[model samples]
Target chain A: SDPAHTATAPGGLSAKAPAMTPLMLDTSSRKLVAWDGTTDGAAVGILAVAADQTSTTLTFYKSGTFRYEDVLWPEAASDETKKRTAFAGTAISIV
Target chain B: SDPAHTATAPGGLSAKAPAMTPLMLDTSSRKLVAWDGTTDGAAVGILAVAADQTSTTLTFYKSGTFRYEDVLWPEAASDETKKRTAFAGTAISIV
Candidate 1:
């Protein structure tokens, strides 16, 4: 199911993990990806600052149809660890 | 406003755009990062295939402390274009 390239890495999984990167959300694909899954990409202007000790909010935002793979990642501690450790790259986006 | 770096990029804006890339969401951060925003990293195995057609859905996923920029990108065609064109890299996710 690899899309970006035609092949996978040395191992058995696709290395196409959608890790963080610069995106170019074109007009066409914007709607499809707008806010829904676990790790929200539509955090618009929201910073990741601790509420208790407020100073500045570390925020993130994305535009255009750069790409995404924010499917339903598991919720178990072990599964979560495995996903992060042996993730198929396809499960790259946060959620 | 800029978090990762200390200065802006030449102009006057913080060039800390959270374009797509590898993520390393921590346990604590994961809670906040789950599905909510426009782009859903919690998409958990969803495919972006053209429903009309029949083929594998191209996807992208991120993990870990990787960075992102999925904030409220302007929705105007011109503004949309500008955000995509002059994006701060903060709005990189596909939601």
Candidate 2:
């Protein structure tokens, strides 16, 4: 179900299409957000990238759960949690 | 040399600790930008995420290059091309 994305924007989908944003991990002050459905969905949860940046412990708002969406450390992605239950910000490590 | 990141920020490095940003591939007017060095580095080139989004014909400014950095479809990332020479936008399709 890979629907070719549209003029996807950053910081969230700008065209309602399935878009993504790259994020960095390190600070514990920034409040990561998590929502359901598309990029413009509601904030169902909140978390921190630092908990997963170089770490395995992901604290998603009410869940400090774990698991790298990309399966590769120093690398991550998030489409506003389009198809998944939720996503922590945009992505992680990759330069 | 995987140096630990710092209070990485969005739109660019907030502290220069090497961070990343997720981007979408669909539009052709986004004028995807590229650069060298860390997140808070310099703008090296310009590209279009659509080039590598669902298609394989990448055109990253001085290069219509090919190959998915992650070797996966619908998924890409960019950290200001920190270690590498350069990186297009953030990432590809991933939801």
Candidate 3:
């Protein structure tokens, strides 16, 4: 397809480049699509949104590979060694 | 000094948002200048470029908080709960 624009987050957690959604990609004749996200939780991370509309099956990984830092005593101090002492919402795609 | 542009890495890594550089901030009469970078290295992260030009001293942290991930066998084959057995360059700022 053509080059289009994707959404980005607001302040607090800087904006991110948008990945190509299946809806945006050409998948009419195809049947499967996928979106994946990954992070190292410190100093290294990667995320990808791929789709394989080959067979009549659509399988893809979830996009939960985001980074979240907390401020706790002795646990959530540094950016890398911090601990996630709380729970956040899950990342689910909507169609 | 205005909303200038910063280079972005291609391919493997996605494009990242640009932080406010010290040169862009108003600090003529001021005497200090600083820039910083940080990353949780995973599904959550943060990076900042701050400065204090009060006592003629510029203090800022290194911007090595970016995330990175490596591929490995059973001993290391994951994102958040993955293993690290390699080395990469550091993130330094130019003045």
Candidate 4:
């Protein structure tokens, strides 16, 4: 039985920008919503939130197509290839 | 002048998800646009892109108010607190 310490481990295997629990920062409602990490996940679930009450159904494709309800957002972007820093628990570093 | 290899350095000062050039993925037009990191940079510049030709002006306040032209997007998100992996040069790791 083991669900052990991530502790970034000590070596060998490594990953970057490893997909974590996807989330949404709703500027329209000044609220944040966490989501499943895939298209199918959002298709069936994103509609169950405050968004469901006030937004329109939307679609997205990542090697496939899917739909969900959503609103306007001011999401951030980055180099993705470069290192990220200054985490406010909004991101993490590990080996 | 040492404009050199970041190589994640090798020491004490550390960071995560540090701010980088923000970007927008235009779902409506199926294109991507990169933006400045701060409000004023955006207010004065974002409108200079292809967005300037086909969108309406919008405002955002991050302790301050700023405006720019933009379109609908299907932005991605996640727990800014967790580690990221699966880098397509879209994110990086460092110490």
Candidate 5:
């Protein structure tokens, strides 16, 4: 609902941003809401406390379509070729 | 020279942090210098335009040793198991 003063890690990750706002997950639409009320795709990367209220995760996609489940932690390295295959555009969420 | 007002990508990656400062590569020492004059290990992740004055890259390592070459972009997913194996600590640098 409001912007947060500090950002915590999701699971075992490290602190991402200094003053990160919490993200609300619209699992129904598979979109993440920022402080300004926009989708995760709005930013190249969005570090938010997951809507599940458990841990943190980065919601990102290479292009056109955005999927919440596709979100990854900054350290969870996957296959680069595969991620780029889905690439289109990227953005990072901010205050 | 000074903290940057914005951060650019290393290659084809996406914007990491906003208002990020540039990192100076101490090629001789193999450590990255942050705006506050600290090594990349000071932060879990540090997003700065490579000192080469070319593009951006995320300098990261999982443990005791801080290797500038070990740095990675936010999207260059490798093997999680290996990352964790090498993983001892992590940090991110910001302005």
Candidate 6:
């Protein structure tokens, strides 16, 4: 009963293979999405869209064992923004 | 004899309580600095300045036990930038 956007398991064997759950970005719906077979996946992080509608910010939520790591962005960002995101940006701070 | 910028302990007792050494940014000197009574403090992270001369980036050094929580920014930033610093930004990534 998976929908069009639902990811299928390899070899059509959902029993043996874990379903591939790709992160989805919906500009039309203004949502950051994922799939959960049982419960809604926990909010792992936040994405902030600036007023310009071109730039964005991402912050991950920290849990008992979770720490910061790589984050993907939507298509609206520019090449320069992508470069900054890889190494460092001019908007970071530590306290 | 503590210097002008040196922080003093409660009741002028530097033994019982630890000294509060604030993070300092020197635009005039082009440095993000801290102090070390014994050895130079570890490079906990990096600071980046945008070519625009208005934006900045900051990242912390992660050690065996260190994890991120909060960050602070310099005073040259506008109030709007400050708000973004505290929350999120248009150029954030985790890698």
Instruction: Please identify which of the two predictions, 4 or 6, would achieve the higher DockQ against the true structure.
Output: 6
- Fnat, model 6, is 0.09
**Model 3 segments more than 4 A misplaced:** A1-43, A51-95, B1-50, B53-88, B91-95
Per-model TM-score on C-alpha atoms: 0.18, 0.19, 0.16, 0.17, 0.21, 0.22
Give stretches of model 2 more than 4 Å off: A1-31, A40-95, B2-24, B27-95
Q: Best TM-score goes to which candidate?
A: 6
True contacts kept of each: 0.09, 0.00, 0.00, 0.00, 0.00, 0.09
lDDT tens digits, residue span B1-95, model 3: 21111211101111232233211111122111221121112111111322232222222222222233211112222333322211112222222
Task: Tell me the tens digit of each residue's lDDT in model 4 across B14-76.
Answer: 111112313333435523333322211111111122222233432211111111112211133
Judged by lDDT, which candidate is best?
5
- Sorted into a CAPRI-style docking class, model 4 comes out as incorrect
Candidate 1 chain A — worst ten consecutive residues by lDDT sum?
A5-14
Given candidate 3, what's the lDDT at residue A54? 28
lDDT of 1 by residue, A1-95 (tens): 32121110011111221223112122333311212213423222211111211211122322122232433222322344333332223222332
Candidate 1 Cα misplacement greater than 4 A, ranges: A1-27, A31-82, A85-95, B1-95
- Per-model chain B TM-scores are 0.17, 0.19, 0.19, 0.20, 0.22, 0.19
Scored against the native two-chain complex, candidate 3 gets a DockQ of 0.04
User: What CA RMSD would you report for each candidate?
Assistant: 18.9, 16.0, 17.9, 19.2, 16.7, 18.3
lDDT of 5 by residue, B1-95 (tens): 21112333333222233222223344455344432332221233344333433334444221122233444522322433222212111222111
Per-residue lDDT tens digits for candidate 5, residues A1-95, read: 32212222222222333222323223223233332233332222244333433333332211123343444522322444333322222222211
Strongest candidate by DockQ? 1
Candidate 4's TM-score on the B chain: 0.20
- In model 5, where do residues sit more than 4 Å from their true spots? A1-33, A38-51, A62-95, B1-34, B37-69, B72-95
